[PDB]
Amino acid sequence: GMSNKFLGTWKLVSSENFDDYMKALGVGLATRKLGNLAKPTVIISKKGDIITIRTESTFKNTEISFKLGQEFEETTADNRKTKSIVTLQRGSLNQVQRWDGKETTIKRKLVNGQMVAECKMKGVVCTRIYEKV
Amino acid sequence: GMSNKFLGTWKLVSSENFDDYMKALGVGLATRKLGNLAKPTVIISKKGDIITIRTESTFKNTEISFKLGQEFEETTADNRKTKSIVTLQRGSLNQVQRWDGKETTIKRKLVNGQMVAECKMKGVVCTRIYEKV
Ligand SMILES: CCCCCCCCCCCCCCCC(=O)O
Numbered sequence A, B: 001g002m003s004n005k006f007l008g009t010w011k012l013v014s015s016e017n018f019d020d021y022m023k024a025l026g027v028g029l030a031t032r033k034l035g036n037l038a039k040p041t042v043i044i045s046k047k048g049d050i051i052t053i054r055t056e057s058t059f060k061n062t063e064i065s066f067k068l069g070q071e072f073e074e075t076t077a078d079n080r081k082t083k084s085i086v087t088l089q090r091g092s093l094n095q096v097q098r099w100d101g102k103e104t105t106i107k108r109k110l111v112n113g114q115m116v117a118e119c120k121m122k123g124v125v126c127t128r129i130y131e132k133v
């Protein structure tokens, strides 16, 4: 299953191309300005086979709890209501969100003890690096 | 998780567009002739969180065991070696197979107590209906 190395609290240390990723998602200007300034903490935990990913920022908090491979309802930081599925591929935690005939993916993997999140929407690709706290 | 109603032995009673589906997969003529004549039995079982799907036919037997949402190595009836993931979406068991930069999906759902498998490759769509034995 998901490596226990994912478990813990993670702080954003780098973000690249997040603005265009938010634009591709339909996020408006004022919201993107705050989104580009946020430095969220992401907390990954598990209880039995339920994994929880919580994101905390001054602007917005989000939380999802899920079992691998089982679709669930999600409300995103920009208030999309999506049907989402998290899978595990070569140790990477891959989240797909679907809504309104669209889809985006957020892939999280460990790289030299950092967690790297790659967000993709319509060919736009964002990379966010987190340091374990 | 997967409904217990999937569990059991299932016999093929109908197949539509399987030949074009096999063609889309790259299956040769002599093999497709046997594939179109086969009436496989599919046995679905589970042990803990490992689900097993076994297919039995005079021509070829196959078996996959997997956990939902976790990628695994699969060898298909036509001898493709794929990386596959089975997910659960609105009660449907959705299998994606990837190999050589290609992908196909086999979605299995229960319809009035029958199991219906829909196989899709490059816009070709096959429907196979099974009756519980
Ligand atoms: C989560 C930071 C708050 C920013 C609020 C702006 C709303 C748009 C963001 C939606 C997509 C969030 C992608 C986060 C991926 C990650 O975990 O690094």
Ligand SMILES: CCCCCCCCCCCCCCCC(=O)O
Binding pocket: B022, B027, B031, B032, B034, B035, B036, B038, B040, B042, B055, B057, B059, B060, B076, B077, B078, B106, B117, B119, B128
């Ligand atoms: C499994 C039947 C034997 C036929 C052998 C021909 C090899 C090509 C078939 C590969 C795809 C099989 C799709 C089966 C979907 C289903 O479970 O109904």
